[PDB]
Amino acid sequence: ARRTWLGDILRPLNSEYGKVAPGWGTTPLMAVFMGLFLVFLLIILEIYNSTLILDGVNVSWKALG
Amino acid sequence: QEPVSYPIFTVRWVAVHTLAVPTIFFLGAIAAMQFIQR
Amino acid sequence: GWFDILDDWLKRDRFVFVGWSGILLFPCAYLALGGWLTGTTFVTSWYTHGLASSYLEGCNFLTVAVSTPANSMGHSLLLLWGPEAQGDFTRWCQLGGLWTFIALHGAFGLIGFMLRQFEIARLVGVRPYNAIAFSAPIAVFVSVFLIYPLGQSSWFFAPSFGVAAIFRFLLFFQGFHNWTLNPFHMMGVAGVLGGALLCAIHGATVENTLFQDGEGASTFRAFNPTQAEETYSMVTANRFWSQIFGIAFSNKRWLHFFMLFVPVTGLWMSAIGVVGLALNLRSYDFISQEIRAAEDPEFETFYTKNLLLNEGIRAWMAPQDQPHENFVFPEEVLPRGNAL
Amino acid sequence: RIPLWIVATVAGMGVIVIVGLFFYGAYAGLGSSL
Amino acid sequence: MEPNPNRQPVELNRTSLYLGLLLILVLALLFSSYFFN
Amino acid sequence: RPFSDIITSVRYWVIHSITIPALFIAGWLFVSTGLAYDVFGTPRPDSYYAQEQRSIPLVTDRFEAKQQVETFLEQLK
Amino acid sequence: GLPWYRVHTVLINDPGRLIAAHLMHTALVAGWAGSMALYELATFDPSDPVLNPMWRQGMFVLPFMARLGVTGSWSGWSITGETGIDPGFWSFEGVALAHIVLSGLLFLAACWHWVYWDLELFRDPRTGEPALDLPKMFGIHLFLAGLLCFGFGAFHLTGLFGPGMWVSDPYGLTGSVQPVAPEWGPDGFNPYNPGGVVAHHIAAGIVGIIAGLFHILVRPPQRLYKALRMGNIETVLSSSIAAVFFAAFVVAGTMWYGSATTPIELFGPTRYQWDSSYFQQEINRRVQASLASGATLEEAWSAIPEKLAFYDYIGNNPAKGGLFRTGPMNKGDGIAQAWKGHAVFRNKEGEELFVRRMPAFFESFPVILTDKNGVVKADIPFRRAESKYSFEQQGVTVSFYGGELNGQTFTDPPTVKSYARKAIFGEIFEFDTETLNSDGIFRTSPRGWFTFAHAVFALLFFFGHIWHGARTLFRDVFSGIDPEL
Amino acid sequence: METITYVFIFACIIALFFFAIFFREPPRIT
Amino acid sequence: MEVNQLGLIATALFVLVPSVFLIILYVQTESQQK
Amino acid sequence: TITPSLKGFFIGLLSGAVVLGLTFAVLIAISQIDK
Ligand code: CLA
Ligand code: CLA
Ligand code: CLA
Ligand SMILES: CC(C)=CCC/C(C)=C/CC/C(C)=C/CC/C(C)=C/CC/C(C)=C/CC/C(C)=C/CC/C(C)=C/CC/C(C)=C/CC/C(C)=C/CC1=CC(=O)C(C)=C(C)C1=O
Ligand SMILES: CC1=C(/C=C/C(C)=C/C=C/C(C)=C/C=C/C=C(C)/C=C/C=C(C)/C=C/C2=C(C)CCCC2(C)C)C(C)(C)CCC1
Ligand SMILES: CC1=C(/C=C/C(C)=C/C=C/C(C)=C/C=C/C=C(C)/C=C/C=C(C)/C=C/C2=C(C)CCCC2(C)C)C(C)(C)CCC1
Ligand SMILES: CC1=C(/C=C/C(C)=C/C=C/C(C)=C/C=C/C=C(C)/C=C/C=C(C)/C=C/C2=C(C)CCCC2(C)C)C(C)(C)CCC1
Ligand SMILES: [Ca+2]
Ligand SMILES: [Fe+2]
Numbered sequence A: 001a002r003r004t005w006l007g008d009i010l011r012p013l014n015s016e017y018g019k020v021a022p023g024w025g026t027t028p029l030m031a032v033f034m035g036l037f038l039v040f041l042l043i044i045l046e047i048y049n050s051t052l053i054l055d056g057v058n059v060s061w062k063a064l065g
Numbered sequence B: 001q002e003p004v005s006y007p008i009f010t011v012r013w014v015a016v017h018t019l020a021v022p023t024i025f026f027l028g029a030i031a032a033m034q035f036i037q038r
Numbered sequence C: 001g002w003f004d005i006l007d008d009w010l011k012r013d014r015f016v017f018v019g020w021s022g023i024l025l026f027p028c029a030y031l032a033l034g035g036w037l038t039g040t041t042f043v044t045s046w047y048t049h050g051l052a053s054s055y056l057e058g059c060n061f062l063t064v065a066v067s068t069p070a071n072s073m074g075h076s077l078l079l080l081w082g083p084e085a086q087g088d089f090t091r092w093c094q095l096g097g098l099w100t101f102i103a104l105h106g107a108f109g110l111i112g113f114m115l116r117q118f119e120i121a122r123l124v125g126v127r128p129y130n131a132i133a134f135s136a137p138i139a140v141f142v143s144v145f146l147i148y149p150l151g152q153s154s155w156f157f158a159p160s161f162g163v164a165a166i167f168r169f170l171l172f173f174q175g176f177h178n179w180t181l182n183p184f185h186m187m188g189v190a191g192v193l194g195g196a197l198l199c200a201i202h203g204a205t206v207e208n209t210l211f212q213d214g215e216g217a218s219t220f221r222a223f224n225p226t227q228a229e230e231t232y233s234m235v236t237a238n239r240f241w242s243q244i245f246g247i248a249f250s251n252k253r254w255l256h257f258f259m260l261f262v263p264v265t266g267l268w269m270s271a272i273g274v275v276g277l278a279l280n281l282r283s284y285d286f287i288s289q290e291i292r293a294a295e296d297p298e299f300e301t302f303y304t305k306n307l308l309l310n311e312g313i314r315a316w317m318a319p320q321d322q323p324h325e326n327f328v329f330p331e332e333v334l335p336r337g338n339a340l
Numbered sequence D: 001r002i003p004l005w006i007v008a009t010v011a012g013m014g015v016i017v018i019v020g021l022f023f024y025g026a027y028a029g030l031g032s033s034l
Numbered sequence E: 001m002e003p004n005p006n007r008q009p010v011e012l013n014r015t016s017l018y019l020g021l022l023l024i025l026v027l028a029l030l031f032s033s034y035f036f037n
Numbered sequence F: 001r002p003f004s005d006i007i008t009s010v011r012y013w014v015i016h017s018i019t020i021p022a023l024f025i026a027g028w029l030f031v032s033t034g035l036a037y038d039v040f041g042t043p044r045p046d047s048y049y050a051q052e053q054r055s056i057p058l059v060t061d062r063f064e065a066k067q068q069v070e071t072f073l074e075q076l077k
Numbered sequence G: 001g002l003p004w005y006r007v008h009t010v011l012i013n014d015p016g017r018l019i020a021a022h023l024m025h026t027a028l029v030a031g032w033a034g035s036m037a038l039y040e041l042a043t044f045d046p047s048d049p050v051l052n053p054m055w056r057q058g059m060f061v062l063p064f065m066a067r068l069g070v071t072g073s074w075s076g077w078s079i080t081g082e083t084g085i086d087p088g089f090w091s092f093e094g095v096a097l098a099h100i101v102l103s104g105l106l107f108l109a110a111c112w113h114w115v116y117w118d119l120e121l122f123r124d125p126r127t128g129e130p131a132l133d134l135p136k137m138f139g140i141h142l143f144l145a146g147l148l149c150f151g152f153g154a155f156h157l158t159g160l161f162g163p164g165m166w167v168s169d170p171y172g173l174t175g176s177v178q179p180v181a182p183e184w185g186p187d188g189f190n191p192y193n194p195g196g197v198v199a200h201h202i203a204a205g206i207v208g209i210i211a212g213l214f215h216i217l218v219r220p221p222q223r224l225y226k227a228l229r230m231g232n233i234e235t236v237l238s239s240s241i242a243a244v245f246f247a248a249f250v251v252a253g254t255m256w257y258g259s260a261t262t263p264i265e266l267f268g269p270t271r272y273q274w275d276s277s278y279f280q281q282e283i284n285r286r287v288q289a290s291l292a293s294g295a296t297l298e299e300a301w302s303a304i305p306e307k308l309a310f311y312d313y314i315g316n317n318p319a320k321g322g323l324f325r326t327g328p329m330n331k332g333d334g335i336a337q338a339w340k341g342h343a344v345f346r347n348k349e350g351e352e353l354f355v356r357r358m359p360a361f362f363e364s365f366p367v368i369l370t371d372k373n374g375v376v377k378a379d380i381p382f383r384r385a386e387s388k389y390s391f392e393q394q395g396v397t398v399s400f401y402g403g404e405l406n407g408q409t410f411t412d413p414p415t416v417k418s419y420a421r422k423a424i425f426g427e428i429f430e431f432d433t434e435t436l437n438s439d440g441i442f443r444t445s446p447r448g449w450f451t452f453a454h455a456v457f458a459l460l461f462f463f464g465h466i467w468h469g470a471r472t473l474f475r476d477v478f479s480g481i482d483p484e485l
Numbered sequence H: 001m002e003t004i005t006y007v008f009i010f011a012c013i014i015a016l017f018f019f020a021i022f023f024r025e026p027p028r029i030t
Numbered sequence I: 001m002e003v004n005q006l007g008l009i010a011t012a013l014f015v016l017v018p019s020v021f022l023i024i025l026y027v028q029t030e031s032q033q034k
Numbered sequence J: 001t002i003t004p005s006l007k008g009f010f011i012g013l014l015s016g017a018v019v020l021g022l023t024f025a026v027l028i029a030i031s032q033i034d035k
Helices: A005-010 A027-048 B012-018 B021-027 B029-033 C002-010 C019-041 C089-094 C097-124 C129-133 C135-151 C164-177 C183-207 C234-244 C252-278 C287-295 C302-321 D004-025 E014-036 F010-032 F035-039 F065-074 G004-011 G015-041 G062-066 G092-115 G134-157 G194-217 G222-227 G233-257 G271-275 G278-292 G297-303 G306-311 G413-423 G446-473 H002-022 I007-030 J004-031
Strands: G165-167 G176-178 G335-339 G342-346 G352-355 G368-370 G376-379 G397-401 G429-432
Touching: A027 J004, B012 B021, B021 B029, B021 C019, B021 F010, B029 D004, B029 F010, C002 C019, C002 J004, C019 C097, C019 J004, C089 C097, C089 F035, C089 F065, C097 C129, C097 C135, C097 G446, C129 C135, C129 C252, C129 G446, C135 C252, C135 G446, C164 C302, C183 C234, C183 C252, C183 E014, C252 G446, C287 C302, E014 H002, E014 I007, F010 F035, G004 G015, G015 G062, G015 G092, G062 G092, G134 G194, G134 G233, G165 G194, G233 G446, G271 G278, G278 G297, G278 G306, G297 G397, G306 G335, G342 G352, G342 G413, G397 G413, H002 I007
Parallel strands: none
Antiparallel strands: G165 G176, G335 G429, G342 G397, G352 G368, G368 G376
16 A cells, blocks of 8 residues: 555545445435436426427527527 | 146236237238228 | 335246336337237328328238328327327327337337346346347347437438338438448448358358267257257367368357357447438448549449439439428439430 | 147138138239229 | 556467458458548 | 147137137227228228329328318318 | 456556546547647638638537637637637637646646555555445545536526627527526526526536535445445446436437537538528518518618528538548538529519429439429420420529629520529529539538437447446356356 | 559458468367 | 548558557567466 | 426326336235235
8 A cells, every 4th residue: 555645635535435324225215316307307308309398488499589 | 846736817828818819809800801892 | 025025026937037127028019019010900101101001901911011200290209198199099190109109119128128138147147148239139220210210300211110111211221322332331231141141151060060969860859958068079160161161160159259249240330320321421422433424424333323223213202202392303304214 | 638730730721711811802902903 | 666466468369360350451441442432 | 837738628719719709700890890990090992082182181290280180081081 | 368358457446547547548538629629720711700610611629619608719810700809818729728738737647646556545444455435436526526517507607707608599690609697497498598508507516516415425225235236346337338328319419409509600500400491481581571671672682691591501401411521511512602692583474483402311303493383384304305394495594682693684594504403402602612622512510420420429338338237237147157957 | 542552452351361271370179 | 533632541540550459469479478 | 387288298297107006006916915
């Protein structure tokens, strides 16, 4: 090894290696934003594809006003 | 394995069934089509 | 925990392995196959391409097909309940909703299936080279049935699902993109053609280089399902080819990896070529050739010849092949040789 | 039970019949040319 | 200056050389036409 | 249960001799009753064009497509 | 030993030399950027932003520098076409300068991290052997990203403490660098509204800052750490690549279809604008308006700004071109010099005819002329043996309004047909074919190339993901299998 | 110039052929 | 004829560079003791 | 606000969740009936 000023100061940030939460930790909470993101994309996708029209949102060169 | 029982409504039954009934519902129509005149 | 119980059930070794993947594969894979079989016999392509496309109308297994949506639709996903069909089913059918249905569904179905290979591989504890390989067919489907038309004016120019309806896709590409002259398509064929060679050649090399492990003529039964010795003389095979072709394998591990490589690489290349045809960035002409052909009327190569074949394909097809363009080409404007 | 070889030759002719009906339909149906 | 212990030697057999060159050359025979265009 | 056994069980045939032709006659009627034509908006031999017209009912714009299609059925197409 | 295609595995767990490597790469990518810049500056012509803008000169990097503010040269000129402007230090030269240096430094840095590979920071106190706590790293990095993402939208795009971004009207005639105000409403999800690009970076930036912290604190549920073989760097890769190619397929789509991010005055028109006769309609709309305010045909068409007419030329359609048709769009049809003017074709009866335009799909297309109702009135015949509509038999003539040929009329068949043959591509222009020694064969715009390149790389990267991912979930069975039945 | 380039590569592939057939690594058993 | 000026050098480096690569390896492999 | 196409989006977003539902319902159930 070879410690160094910067090296020590950063030593903490990299040390908790294999440290894991137990069981199904935060998984379920995560599986929700995930599903939310999935729906969010489908929306912005379907908006660009003009499948989901929304007065106020005009998906063309114009709208620049 | 087991005193050789076997259930009637198995699992694979489904697989071979959703590809079964329809196959006939079509090959039954498709034939009846041959008689459509102009 | 229910999860591990849900798992347990799924990964249970049945006749038709389900697995987590199946939750995606089977729903889609069946819907794709189903939609095709449905349209092939019931839905028409009149309101879409001015074409009869189902058994119900009189088409036979070759002429039937699930034709693309109108060009008006553009790249619309055409959902059954979207602005187009508006929840209505019959209309959906007449607007070619069944295309994006088969397309998009089958698409997920190829994802599920590759995942399956990956999942089953893991369980059975074997290496996933069957999955790597299947990337090749995904690429083809993705670039051709999705990326391509995504670069064009709309889904209308994607290949319609059907036998003949695919031949016109071929003829089109020749005529408009002069696709046969593309370095990538060539590699493509070198791989598929070359891959169908390794297949045949390796098979025969094995069957005619076998050891005798039985007293019968039909040597099929003479096989040890339970490993042990090599069933064919790898050493003899080496000497054969080494004397008839000059080159010959001698490392079954490589000979078999090669067989994965050749056709998977080929299809990957053929894909890139198409990803480029999306933007119409084709390999249509050779400029040096065109310049000499302009100034000098007696210069003629098998290349110039071809380009003229293309002109004819485009001029005589465009009309009934791109209805939305209301093309009208007076008889006098139609390119034609003498007499014909 | 029903002897397999019979299940086959029966289900077999049965297909040549339906697939043959299709071939006839080709010179009469709408897929005709007349 | 401790001799880094993560290094292994590199190898390319004769057959690979050949398979390699065969690929380079033919690709070159395939793309040169389009380079000169 | 080993297919072989089932495809041979007189019970099987006793069931399917009924079921199979059942499905068949159903689909047949599906076509023969003209129902299929309406379920799929597929034209009947006498519904591609109006008597005189020789033009095609090409859908020309996405959003007002369904509406446009309906009108095509109008000219007795 | 190691097969040629594995030589880089010598880093799989040498955090030191992995950083040394990643440093060298960044050096080359930064280096490339700097010098690709200088190459464009040594060949780009600012003499005319109207008919010879960067996207006609095969400029690829120059546009990405304008989209964010840099629009001037230390030599005095500027992208918009103004003079007397003082870009300050951040001129194209400046940007190019900067990267070349950042590259030199990253180089030196890559060297140091290579020689001093065994810093203690990479060794786990516990096992005393090399190790990197990925989960915490990801949290840290993700924190910095959102922190920077935030700033970019918050200060740069808004103008608070920055230039702004490229913004233009609906027909790329006014474009420039302007401060853009956020937009959290719904229309901010509209690809064509700049406000959305601002809101996004502020919101996503914050969400990014929050989420980072989370990951800096909360640890990975055992179940996952196990499933996604975390603590195995070769999996960080499989996921990143999956993201990188996702990002790629998206930029390729917004470049081809257009968005406030790929502005036409910087990347060129869209194949779709030509398809829907986008600019053709804006012109007419304008011309008919002038006629209402009692102008003459000459006056009406003369009012039509050259720049506008130029977008209505199939020679700027990215869908024309070829894979080996190299260079700028100028090696094709030539450097655009001026607008010859609107061409109106008429036949003996005075009837006004119209030239059927060339669909992008067709390399070559026939000259056909129809009236308003679409009736074929005239054409250029192949077999003359029985031609009914030759320009000769119809007395076709051509007149021009506004532009070089304004007020002139031509009646000798050949000349009429020449122009008819040109009408096919839309507005007729005057090119300088000498200079670049052009060949007259259409080439695609930067918009087109960027799109082709990214759509390929993306599709290629998919394979990398599938490969590396697999190699992570099957590390155990790698090298082969073993026993049982 | 082009002709020369085409023939050269061809000539190079044939050379390869030779060396590959007659100068391979003798294939050794067991 | 009317070809591309860079075509020659593009083809030359396209062949040389990677060939030179392989060759550097093969020879350094080939000369590894034992 | 809440335009016809917006209503349709919900109809599909709702008709979608249902399918995922009945599917995971049925599955989670039969799974917990033998293993
Ligand atoms: C990543 C995207 C990218 C894009 C889109 C562009 C786009 C462009 N460049 Mg740049 N360029 C790039 C990266 C990129 N460049 C880099 C990294 C460099 C430095 C090395 C350069 C250096 C450069 C110069 C010096 C010039 C350009 C120019 C141009 C324009 C040329 C027009 C043309 O005809 O292209 C031509 C495109 C091709 C030939 C691509 C085809 C690749 C094929 C031949 C081979 C694939 C090989 C492989 C072996 C195949 C199979 C392998 C098998 C194992 C499977 C164009 C706008 C010109 C310009 O600006 O003019 C005004 C110009 O002079 N570029
Ligand atoms: C994005 C980051 C990324 C990274 C870090 C890696 C890293 C790695 N890959 Mg990998 N890969 C990627 C993307 C990536 N890949 C993609 C997108 C694909 C799909 C094409 C693959 C397909 C792939 C395969 C099939 C294999 C690897 C293997 C490997 C390991 C190879 C050792 C090596 O460096 O060979 C050294 C390489 C050479 C000596 C010559 C390469 C010459 C050509 C290809 C490129 C010349 C440079 C080009 C002009 C630069 C522009 C690149 C562009 C993307 C910007 C290494 C860990 C191998 C492995 O893990 O074996 C156990 C292996 O078999 N990769
Ligand atoms: C098993 C997997 C599966 C998958 C992946 C799909 C996928 C798809 N189907 Mg499909 N289908 C399936 C099974 C499946 N199907 C089955 C079993 C049937 C027979 C019942 C059908 C019958 C069917 C039809 C009839 C049609 C489709 C269609 C489609 C596409 C619809 C596009 C869409 O809006 O998605 C729907 C997406 C969602 C519902 C998002 C899920 C979001 C989850 C994660 C969270 C929800 C949270 C909460 C409730 C949200 C509230 C938020 C609040 C702010 C309001 C899409 C590709 C359409 C099509 O093919 O058009 C061309 C179509 O018409 N499918
Ligand atoms: C000046 C002049 C005259 C110039 C030119 C003349 C001219 C016309 C040249 C034409 C050539 C030309 C330009 C061709 C273009 C095509 C080309 C170069 C494409 C290159 C790019 C490309 C296709 C890349 C990737 C795609 C790919 C993987 C293709 C693979 C093709 C390929 C090698 C197929 C295999 C063919 C083949 C003979 C395999 C044999 C295998 C082996 C020897 C079998 C023997 C054997 C079998 C066993 O079973 C066992 C057990 C053993 C032990 C064993 O040994
Ligand atoms: C679409 C859809 C749906 C549904 C439906 C389905 C899913 C269906 C299916 C269907 C099916 C699934 C069908 C099938 C059919 C089939 C047929 C009709 C067949 C035929 C066959 C034949 C004819 C054969 C023959 C042969 C061969 C091939 C080989 C040789 C020998 C013989 C001769 C035997 C839903 C609502 C979800 C949604 C929307 C869409
Ligand atoms: C499923 C299956 C199958 C099938 C099969 C089948 C279905 C068959 C059939 C068959 C048949 C079905 C046959 C028949 C035959 C016949 C014959 C061989 C006959 C002969 C005859 C004669 C010779 C006659 C005579 C006469 C008369 C009648 C009258 C007039 C005169 C005269 C005298 C001539 C197989 C095995 C492959 C295997 C797998 C499975
Ligand atoms: C150290 C130092 C310095 C300096 C430095 C320098 C000057 C650097 C540079 C650097 C550089 C100047 C760099 C460059 C780079 C480049 C690159 C890195 C490139 C790349 C490329 C590529 C990769 C390509 C590719 C390709 C081709 C060719 C064709 C086909 C297609 C593709 C795209 C694939 C100073 C004095 C300040 C001071 C301090 C220290
Ligand atoms: Ca009648
Ligand atoms: Fe084999």
